[PDB]
């Protein structure tokens, strides 16, 4: 693409903020999902409000044309929604504005053709009634995978944004349910929990990196997506979180070499729930959540601001290399002795879209049972 580098930096920027607040919490969010959520909102904003958002998404308005930005997100979100995608990425934006409000139709239109988003008007006077609706939107939109998203709503809520994303990929080269068994996972230097561990001896795009002091594993998903897992050596987790760059990751994706290995990877499900206002505030995006928010692109006469913005990400990782079978690869294993690589301790991961090189997900697993 062309806005990929910016997205990559936005992601690490946001990841480090969340990782610095604690080192015992799992982390899971979607760089693409969130950036597009606000790039969209920037269409109904002006001046500092509008400029603050695009720069909080790591865009230098002094060197890049806005049209280029929205131009890119349209194509990116375009390919992510292909009805014939083996990927099966179900993501959506919930725009909820107070009832009885003059909305520029040009806005409601762009939010449609460019950001494939849906805008809804509701009675925010009735809290426990508008909240029950917003959650019924996600649920009926996520095949029920995500429920009771919104916990509570403020009083003077007039503008609320709900961003969600669900994903369960199908490995190009799947694991066998029959080999999955419980193994210890080290949440820390002297503590362990049990977790179902998938395992398979095979040819993997795996290698140990000295610069990162970590094992780097790359696995393909049906639908043109790649998962990159980083298993840091003893005591090098922070080191790893600080050395990661977009170029490092790009180098690893150009390598197609496979080597023998007995891999143990946990079967798990992770979710990330974040308050975009709270989180994006530390990145410099505030004006849009304030009274002085210039949202005249949305409503033309009445005062408007973003009251609440939530992001919810769900990622499931299991054996399946599809709901069904068919093809069937066959790998030639060398006779040499293969290394046993176990992801039985905290590790960081990225899920990259092969076409654009955009990060669909970024996360960290510290405790698989939490």
UniProtKB/Swiss-Prot annotation:
Changing residue 62 to M: In Z-Bristol; deficient AA; disrupts the N-glycosylation site N-60. Changing residue 44 to E: In M-Mineral springs; causes reduced AAT secretion. GO terms for cellular component: collagen-containing extracellular matrix; COPII-coated ER to Golgi transport vesicle; endoplasmic reticulum; endoplasmic reticulum lumen; endoplasmic reticulum-Golgi intermediate compartment membrane; extracellular exosome; extracellular region; extracellular space. The modification Phosphoserine is found at residue 336. Keywords: Acute phase, Blood coagulation, Endoplasmic reticulum, Extracellular matrix, Glycoprotein, Hemostasis, Phosphoprotein, Protease inhibitor, Secreted, Serine protease inhibitor, Signal. The keyword Signal applies. SUPFAM superfamilies: Serpins (SSF56574). N-glycosylated. Differential glycosylation produces a number of isoforms. N-linked glycan at Asn-60 is alternatively di-antennary, tri-antennary or tetra-antennary. The glycan at Asn-23 is di-antennary with trace amounts of tri-antennary. Glycan at Asn-224 is exclusively di-antennary. Structure of glycans at Asn-23 and Asn-224 is Hex5HexNAc4. The structure of the antennae is Neu5Ac(alpha1-6)Gal(beta1-4)GlcNAc attached to the core structure Man(alpha1-6)[Man(alpha1-3)]Man(beta1-4)GlcNAc(beta1-4)GlcNAc. Some antennae are fucosylated, which forms a Lewis-X determinant. (Microbial infection) Proteolytically processed by Staphylococcus aureus seryl, cysteinyl, and metallo-proteases. The modification S-cysteinyl cysteine is found at residue 209. Changing residue 318 to N: In P-St.Albans/P-Donauwoerth. It is found in: Secreted; Endoplasmic reticulum. Residues 321-345 are annotated as: RCL. It holds the Pfam family Serpin. The keyword Endoplasmic reticulum applies. GO terms for molecular function: identical protein binding; protease binding; serine-type endopeptidase inhibitor activity. Changing residue 69 to N: In QO-Ludwigshafen. Glycans are attached at residues 23, 60, 224. Ubiquitous. Expressed in leukocytes and plasma. The record marks 335-336 as: Reactive bond. The record marks 305-308 as: (Microbial infection) Cleavage. Interacts with CELA2A. Interacts with ERGIC3 and LMAN1/ERGIC53. Interacts with PRSS1/trypsin. Interacts with PRSS1/Trypsin. The variants S and Z interact with CANX and PDIA3. The reactive center loop (RCL) extends out from the body of the protein and directs binding to the target protease. The protease cleaves the serpin at the reactive site within the RCL, establishing a covalent linkage between the carboxyl group of the serpin reactive site and the serine hydroxyl of the protease. The resulting inactive serpin-protease complex is highly stable. Inhibitor of serine proteases. Its primary target is elastase, but it also has a moderate affinity for plasmin and thrombin. Irreversibly inhibits trypsin, chymotrypsin and plasminogen activator. The aberrant form inhibits insulin-induced NO synthesis in platelets, decreases coagulation time and has proteolytic activity against insulin and plasmin. The aberrant form is found in the plasma of chronic smokers, and persists after smoking is ceased. It can still be found ten years after smoking has ceased. It is linked to Alpha-1-antitrypsin deficiency: A disorder whose most common manifestation is emphysema, which becomes evident by the third to fourth decade. A less common manifestation of the deficiency is liver disease, which occurs in children and adults, and may result in cirrhosis and liver failure. Environmental factors, particularly cigarette smoking, greatly increase the risk of emphysema at an earlier age. This is Alpha-1-antitrypsin. It comes from Homo sapiens (Human). The lineage of its organism: Eukaryota, Metazoa, Chordata, Craniata, Vertebrata. The gene is SERPINA1.
